[PDB]
Amino acid sequence: YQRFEQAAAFGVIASNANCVWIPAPGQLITSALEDVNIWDIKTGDLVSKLSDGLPPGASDARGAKPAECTYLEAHKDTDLLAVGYADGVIKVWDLMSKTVLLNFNGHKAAITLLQFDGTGTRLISGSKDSNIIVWDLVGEVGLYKLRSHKDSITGFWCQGEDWLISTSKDGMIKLWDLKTHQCIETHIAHTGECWGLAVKDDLLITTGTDSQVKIWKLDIENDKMGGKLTEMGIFEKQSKQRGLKIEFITNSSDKTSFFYIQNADKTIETFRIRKEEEIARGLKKREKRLLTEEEIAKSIYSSFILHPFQTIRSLYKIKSASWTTVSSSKLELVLTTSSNTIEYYSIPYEKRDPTSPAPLKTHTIELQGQRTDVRSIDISDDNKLLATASNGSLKIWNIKTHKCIRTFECGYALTCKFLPGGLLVILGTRNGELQLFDLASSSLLDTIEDAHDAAIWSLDLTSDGKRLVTGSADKTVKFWDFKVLKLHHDTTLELTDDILCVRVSPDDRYLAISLLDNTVKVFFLDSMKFYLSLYGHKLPVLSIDISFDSKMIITSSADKNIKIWGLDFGDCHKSLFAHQDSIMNVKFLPQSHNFFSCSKDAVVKYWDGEKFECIQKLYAHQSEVWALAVATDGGFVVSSSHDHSIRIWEETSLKAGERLMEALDLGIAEIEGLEAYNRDMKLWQRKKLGEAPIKPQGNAVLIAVNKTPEQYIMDTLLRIRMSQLEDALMVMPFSYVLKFLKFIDTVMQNKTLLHSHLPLICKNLFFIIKFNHKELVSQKNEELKLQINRVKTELRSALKSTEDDLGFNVQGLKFVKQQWNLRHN
Amino acid sequence: QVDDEYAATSGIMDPRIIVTTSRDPSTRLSQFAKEIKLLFPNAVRLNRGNYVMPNLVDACKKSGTTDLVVLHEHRGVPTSLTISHFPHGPTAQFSLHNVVMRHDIINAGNQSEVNPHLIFDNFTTALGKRVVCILKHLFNAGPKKDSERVITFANRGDFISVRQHVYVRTREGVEIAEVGPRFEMRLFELRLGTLENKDADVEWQLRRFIRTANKKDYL
Amino acid sequence: YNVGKAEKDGEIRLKNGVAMSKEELTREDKNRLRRALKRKRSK
Amino acid sequence: QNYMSKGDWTNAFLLAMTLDHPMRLFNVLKRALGESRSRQEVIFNEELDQAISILNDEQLILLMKRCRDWNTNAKTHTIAQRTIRCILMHHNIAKLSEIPGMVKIVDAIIPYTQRHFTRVDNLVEQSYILDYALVEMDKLF
Amino acid sequence: AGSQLKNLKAALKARGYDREEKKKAIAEIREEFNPFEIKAARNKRIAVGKPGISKQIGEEQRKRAFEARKMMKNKRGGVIDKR
RNA sequence: CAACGAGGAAUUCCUAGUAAGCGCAAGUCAUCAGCUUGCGUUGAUUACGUCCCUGCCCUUUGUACACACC
Structure with a gap:
């Protein structure tokens, strides 16, 4: 048959994802559905549509929806694009040759953030399932999986190798020690969800469901358990909806910082944070009327250190934003809205006045779309x-x-x-x-x-x-x-x-x-x-x-x-x-x-x-296909849908006993190797220190499973079952019985795993010597005689030590019951 | 329902079956008897050579076997089977007509040996209910309801077609496959005592030479 | 005496004699224990 | 979680008792008991059994309910016996009797301790095959 | 070796709103997993016959022959088609 | 100046009055005489263990009441 295929897709400029900005104003990488397209803001012509090398509709296209792109992220200097999709996969591309370098599936649901860290070679990824994974790019490997959140990662912030801090779609913000990969400090940020996270090194800022924006002080060098991240006060916004992206900058040429909170609807609230000089010279003015009440007023900080700014609106519902700055009079902010359109605004500010009643868009790329x-x-x-x-x-x-x-x-x-x-x-x-x-x-x-x-x-x-x-x-x-x-x-x-x-x-x-x-x-x-x-x-x-x-x-x-x-x-x-x-x-x-x-x-x-x-x-397609039209002659068909897309379609096994035996042989070989090493150390410390043995390197499997040989033998002795234990102990010969006695003799010096395995050690040891009694009492060696005596003393001491408190507790508990009885029976 | 010489141990107890040949059997009859002993479960095969039938019956019914299947041949091709139920019960003896066996045709693998399901098609008369009871009390009571082998005794004008199938249940129906020997057996005699005597009273035997012979079924 | 079921619905006591509390146990062990008592409630 | 990771079993014990996390309570008691057998009147470390000595009525009744249903194993019973022993030797016996609910627990766990006493005593009884084998090995010459 | 049931479940997982693929797959597995309607001999150095199909055609042939003779049996006329 | 001196590759069946040898009778409403079913006579070798291979099956709360084990 002469089957169909897809020639080209278009009609989308900005889709259900974020946007990254690249400097030359500059260009912009954004998402079409399942492929990323680059645009030059200056003119607006589509200079690149980086897509998958396989046409959707071909012979090997798989029987499901294609993975919608959901997060763009860009490494500027080494020129990489880490993009992530709605099934969970992450494709990392070089923007020079536009091929796929790295595939990083990893997750189970759609992903929500990427971030390059230590500028190259490390990428952290948070997803709609609550995991957050660190990836290396020189090893193509998921290094670590930070796994303690409960709903969906809404943001994070990392510094290199020691501290990450994430916040998720439950109410919770978490701080992660990336050396141990255990969560250190957990707070409830907002009572519903927690949608925002940004931080300029001293202060951290979060937002939740409705207008309550919370300032936190993270003190990284703290030592207390609760107090690595403390909360310093809340304030309000003008939008009662979900603020869902916060981002900071440090403009140079004095030093100053600005952050925006984009909202659900139509509006980005911009803020200038002020500086320490006006903190110090504004403290007294609210400290007027002269101190418990004044201390309560000084504690109740947000409106103090933060200064609202020109609240940039738009025609449509806002999906993503990012800016650049010079001079503090060129806060130049690109903005992709939901009804497919990007908009390059820029607010000026003469360092005291924002010089406009409402900000002005300098560019708008909207020609190749529909808005509906x-x-x-x-x-x-x-x-x-x-x-x-x-x-x-x-x-x-x-x-x-x-x-x-x-x-x-x-x-x-x-x-x-x-x-x-x-x-x-x-x-x-x-x-x-x-x-x-x-x-x-x-x-x-x-x-x-x-x-x-x-x-x-x-x-x-x-x-x-x-x-x-x-x-x-x-x-x-x-x-x-x-x-x-x-x-x-x-x-x-x-x-x-x-x-x-x-x-x-x-x-x-x-x-x-x-x-x-x-x-x-x-x-x-x-x-x-x-x-x-x-x-x-x-x-x-x-x-x-x-x-x-x-x-x-x-x-x-x-x-x-x-x-x-x-x-x-x-x-x-x-x-x-x-x-x-x-x-x-x-x-x-x-x-x-x-x-x-x-x-x-x-x-x-x-x-x-x-x-x-x-x-x-x-x-x-990704959503509801509203119409399609066939050519009048020839028969290629176009289809157009609800995701603002228009696309063309043209023609073309041991067992117990021997497991215990091999474990016993390697364990006792390691044990007497270390004992020979210790005898060598005592002889070369008690004699002319001119020589000694070089090194016994520990066993491969023992350092691979991170176990002392007593623990290794102890857990394989645990892992045999009770039905074939009397057969596992009967199969092994008398040389393995003698080294089993050496194993028991060593293990009842470590009195931790003696007392946690007392009836198992007793059952196995007593069956072993009861079965091998005829040969054991015919062996002639004082080493084994002293061995049996030492095992006997330590084992019976452990057993009488546990039945001492057993008998104590019997007599004490029946005394308690009997004195209750003679009190009020 | 279960009749008067099976009602004591209808579903209480599993059966116990011996499968044995006529006398000095041919190799295809020995293959056939192995196929019958792994057609129905808790059946074992016994090498009849130099066995007398009275002391064979006595040894079976004091060892505790429930019933006996004796197979008769004709130059490989098996021609008869007698089912004798031992606690002074009935013998139904049948002739076998269109026998095709898997040892003849194809190494198609191994069988399934599960307690099977049983289909009985239009055994409408009381003699039909009698032969249904004698044919299904040599099977194991109460299989699992997802057992994947079924066998069928379908009456087709006094010729019981006997087959065995395995099945899975797919999305649009059920897909069947044929295991084991197909037959058409037909009852030529029932009688009410065991196999030892032939002095037992006959409940039914077909009348071949009456002039109203081919007018009715289960005559 | 024998180990019965838990007396409140914030914990479970297995027949073993060990007990988990609903909030304390991890979600992987909550899936595992839900599956386990589902089988134990299926047989 | 931070205490259970970094060690520090006493404040971990009282937080597991306050939150009522029973598997974590068994783990902190088992880990502290094992390190108590390791190092060297006192059966846990001194800070933890003082922390057991200073808990109130409803806390020690839930602690003894935990000890009750740990004592039904023959495996997890040693931890229960050490905790019962430190409660008995650090609390007042008249107080322990007159707490409302402390007879339906101690009558539940007297016969289990007697069962374990019989089993461990028989282990000590059949531990003398080592002594018999030693007297044969000394008769060998 | 392995069971016909195990091989049948494997064949169904192999074959897996089209209709003719299911018609083809069902007819293929039926005529494959029905071994009692072919006949196989043993090569002394193999499907050698189709018994039921040969029987069906041999008896339908004489069935139409018997109905033709029963139609002929008491006739006396006949059209004489010289065309 | 044809076949053939115990029958290749493969394959099937078989555990005590059994395999196999041996003859003698019958011919029982179906089947059988190009044979079938009885009946006695003579009567062994090797397994009688094991789930290692090939498969088939069962269970995965111990429940059923102690003791013990888990």
């Missing part, structure tokens, strides 16, 4: 493309360059079409209005106010284009002719119910209209004849399509299935269940009975109309 979801897409013969929006941003992109060359202002527009000669656009809006535009001249040929009484929903041209059909939610359809380039309403068919889709056949033959009452009706255009009524869909029914032979129709709806109907008798053929949310649109190919259907669950699907298989399951 594209409710209707369309195409030319093959050259141009039509995107219809809610703000009014009709845009005429072109296929061969992916640039909007022409744009207008219409309104809440939901359907549109071209006109068959090209260079002319019809459109209907969500109120009772229709509109006409072109390509060479300006916007409005004419609008028709009161084109319909209520919301228009779907229009369609005839194949010659002279006559179009508009169906609207005022329970009417209307017909319009083109008189000479103006619209002529002549007839109107009022139904009983809100018509919400129209279509004609591609050979002027049928008019199929989809009502809200779960059905469609097929009429003859030449008679308004009411040929057919197709019924049985069971929810209100979206897009129709008529085939090229005018024999076979499709019918999509919110019932998550598309129905194929034969139009000769109105008989159904299939009722195939696709698309687990809602099929928004469905369109045939030009010459074939194959068709496409794009749906409200971020997927388009390629089907055939003969076997009714699914030919292909294309998976490049």
